[PDB]
Amino acid sequence: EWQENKSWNAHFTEHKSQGVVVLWNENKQQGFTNNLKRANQAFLPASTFKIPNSLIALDLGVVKDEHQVFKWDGQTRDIATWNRDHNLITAMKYSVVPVYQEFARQIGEARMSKMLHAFDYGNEDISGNVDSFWLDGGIRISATEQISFLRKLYHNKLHVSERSQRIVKQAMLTEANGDYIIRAKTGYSTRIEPKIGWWVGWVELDDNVWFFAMNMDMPTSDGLGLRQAITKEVLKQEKIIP
Numbered sequence: 001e002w003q004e005n006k007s008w009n010a011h012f013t014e015h016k017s018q019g020v021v022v023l024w025n026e027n028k029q030q031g032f033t034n035n036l037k038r039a040n041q042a043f044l045p046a047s048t049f050k051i052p053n054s055l056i057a058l059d060l061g062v063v064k065d066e067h068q069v070f071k072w073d074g075q076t077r078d079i080a081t082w083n084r085d086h087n088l089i090t091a092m093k094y095s096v097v098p099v100y101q102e103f104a105r106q107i108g109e110a111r112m113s114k115m116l117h118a119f120d121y122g123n124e125d126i127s128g129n130v131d132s133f134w135l136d137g138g139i140r141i142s143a144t145e146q147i148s149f150l151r152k153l154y155h156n157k158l159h160v161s162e163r164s165q166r167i168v169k170q171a172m173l174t175e176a177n178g179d180y181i182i183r184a185k186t187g188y189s190t191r192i193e194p195k196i197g198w199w200v201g202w203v204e205l206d207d208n209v210w211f212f213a214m215n216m217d218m219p220t221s222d223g224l225g226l227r228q229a230i231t232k233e234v235l236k237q238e239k240i241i242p
């Protein structure tokens, strides 16, 4: 049961942008979106792929645990937070592409492809370079497909160990207070048009969980903060968060 609420378009147009928010009420098994078409249009996952990539790296032993240190390779990159050592937690927090590129190389094409199929993840197509296919290869995923994948992770139903799923959900922790917990991952796709930003995850309440997946046009990096801001305005409008 899906419902289209075009009134949310105001949250995008008011910021001179276009995009989609998809919400899923777990208790009621009901979905909501401002744009049914765009909700099912498939985009590069970009750094949202760090969720499945983390799961695979942990389950195969490429990553021992969330404490293992991935040493900076000494190559100065334009994002200061990348020029340092990281563990799984900080690598997720700062979307440290080069750490996850090495994960993918150690995972390898064959095992990566099999795992994405087992996860039913997007179009399951890793065509391209194994260390960048989620940035400029053939893999694609829609907002509704993100929700489906995230729900499996929440319920520990993905075909990796419970431990791997618990660790990745810890690493997804973004915000927590007395009212809610948000576990999510941002994404920023620039190598293939249209340039977009992602924010996918869920909101944990005392008595329910709301899954969310949004993407929006992102012609410049100046609007990246709108990914979370627009999502939270929708959540506030729907009285999911205060």
Ligand SMILES: O=C(O)c1cccc(-c2cccc(CO)c2)c1
Binding pocket: 047, 078, 079, 094, 095, 186, 187, 188, 221, 224
């Ligand atoms: O999604 C973000 O919030 C985020 C976090 C860390 C880095 C970036 C990012 C911004 C511009 C270019 C590049 C490419 O090197 C990356 C975006």
Ligand SMILES: [Cl-]
Binding pocket: 169, 170, 173
């Ligand atoms: Cl946690």
